């Protein structure tokens with residue numbers, strides 16, 4: 001299962017001390033909390049709430065001068081039948097040649113009679129991405145015009161409607177990876193960074209994929225550097241995990257040799273797919289720290 005990551009993959013934080021200090025002190029706690037609050041509502045595909053959450057994501061980023069495409073399509077799910085799914089694709093430069101993609105799923109799992117909020121899964125991850133664009137507004141402006149740019153991708157229909165299987169999960173990612181495959185729009189992904197199950201306490205991360213192990217070690221180094229500077233209020237292990245075959249929105253991209261960085265803890269939060277994955281499970285020290293590490297990774301990668 002676990003192997004120590006070899007030195008060849010170490011990839012220390014590169015930002016200059018003044019820039020690392022400057023950027024690591026950018027935050028917006030209130031906005032992060034407000035974004036969480038707006039998304040932390042039952043949001044099953046096809047519900048009014050599902051549309052409201054899409055609108056909030058869409059308008060938040062449009063107001064930050066991002067280009068936002070909504071990829072709408074129909075597909076049949078068990079129980080529900082014909083559903084209208086809506087992936088959200090936000091770019092700072094819509095005419096960039098290449099992208100770092102940060103992603104999370106915005107739907108919540110259909111759990112009859114239970115108003116499942118999916119706080120970690122993935123209300124908090126989506127919020128971290130809105131918060132990232134909000135916090136780093138100034139520093140990301142250059143990426144509106146550059147060849148390498150940033151994409152925030154919000155997947156729809158990640159969750160199963162009946163029982164998690166290859167045909168009853170990741171509805172939006174399966175459609176989009178297929179669509180981009182056909183349109184020749186997958187090679188442009190430097191890597192797809194997928195945030196999932198974040199916001200609960202004591203997350204442990206591991207590198208899942210050897211072609212991105214090096215950029216995992218850049219996040220690990222960001223975390224180390226922040227610890228040393230007293231900027232955190234450890235998560236990333238210097239170990240990789242093989243034959244874990246965790247299924248999520250990345251799979252249809254992974255299958256087609258898009259490099260994945262899967263930011264999902266192992267073990268999953270204890271409250272996973274229970275009603276306790278709600279407002280009360282969110283650890284806001286952990287959430288602030290993770291959001292920061294991810295914001296700095298993004299800046300490390302993109303400059």
Ligand SMILES: COc1ccc(NC(=S)NCCCn2ccnc2)cc1OC
Nearest residue numbers: 121196197245246247248266267268272
């Ligand atoms: C009990 O913890 C686990 C449960 C299942 C699996 N195996 C798979 S294939 N999970 C697919 C995850 C889909 N998903 C992610 C977020 N919302 C839904 C691994 C677990 O711990 C490693």
Ligand SMILES: [Cl-]
Nearest residue numbers: 047048049050
């Ligand atoms: Cl509703």
Ligand SMILES: [Zn+2]
Nearest residue numbers: 109121159273
């Ligand atoms: Zn889930």
